[PDB]
Amino acid sequence: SATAGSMNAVKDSLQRGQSTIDVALAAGDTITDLLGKMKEKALAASDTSLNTASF
Amino acid sequence: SATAGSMNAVKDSLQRGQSTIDVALAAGDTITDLLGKMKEKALAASDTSLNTASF
């Protein structure tokens, strides 16, 4: 009965880790969006046709 | 007749020992529940993901 009643702490630790991973995945989605946008900005800046103010 | 009448003290001693053992068994039930709660506390505190306050 003691070993069976000890399981609640384990389940709580797993839910806590799942919540931390969810927050990390949300932050990673934001980082991926910003990364794609900077890749667009860099590919646009790489062209030699642009002038100084656009650059 | 003296040996037959002498047995009341023996019966009283056995009953007194049974009573003492019952008190010890109640205290042991309480100590067992407390030990199980301590196991749950230490097992919850083993996790590294907790912040200082919960620990």
Side-chain angles (χ1 to χ4, degrees):
Chain A
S1 310
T3 300
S6 296
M7 296 296 172
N8 312 339
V10 171
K11 293 187 286 184
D12 291 331
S13 179
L14 309 183
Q15 315 183 66
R16 186 177 299 111
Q18 288 201 264
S19 296
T20 316
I21 295 196
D22 297 341
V23 176
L25 299 148
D29 280 341
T30 300
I31 301 299
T32 300
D33 174 16
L34 294 160
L35 282 184
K37 291 174 70 175
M38 278 163 312
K39 184 178 184 293
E40 292 278 308
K41 295 270 172 223
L43 183 63
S46 179
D47 177 349
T48 53
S49 296
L50 286 156
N51 63 7
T52 300
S54 296
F55 172 78
Chain B
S1 179
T3 300
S6 176
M7 305 276 195
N8 300 344
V10 184
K11 293 187 286 185
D12 291 331
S13 191
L14 304 172
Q15 293 179 356
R16 172 170 326 111
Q18 282 189 261
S19 278
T20 300
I21 284 163
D22 304 358
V23 187
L25 288 171
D29 267 356
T30 296
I31 291 145
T32 300
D33 291 331
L34 292 191
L35 270 182
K37 291 174 71 175
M38 284 165 96
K39 183 168 159 216
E40 274 154 49
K41 298 293 183 182
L43 183 63
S46 172
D47 170 16
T48 300
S49 75
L50 293 189
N51 63 7
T52 297
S54 291
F55 182 76

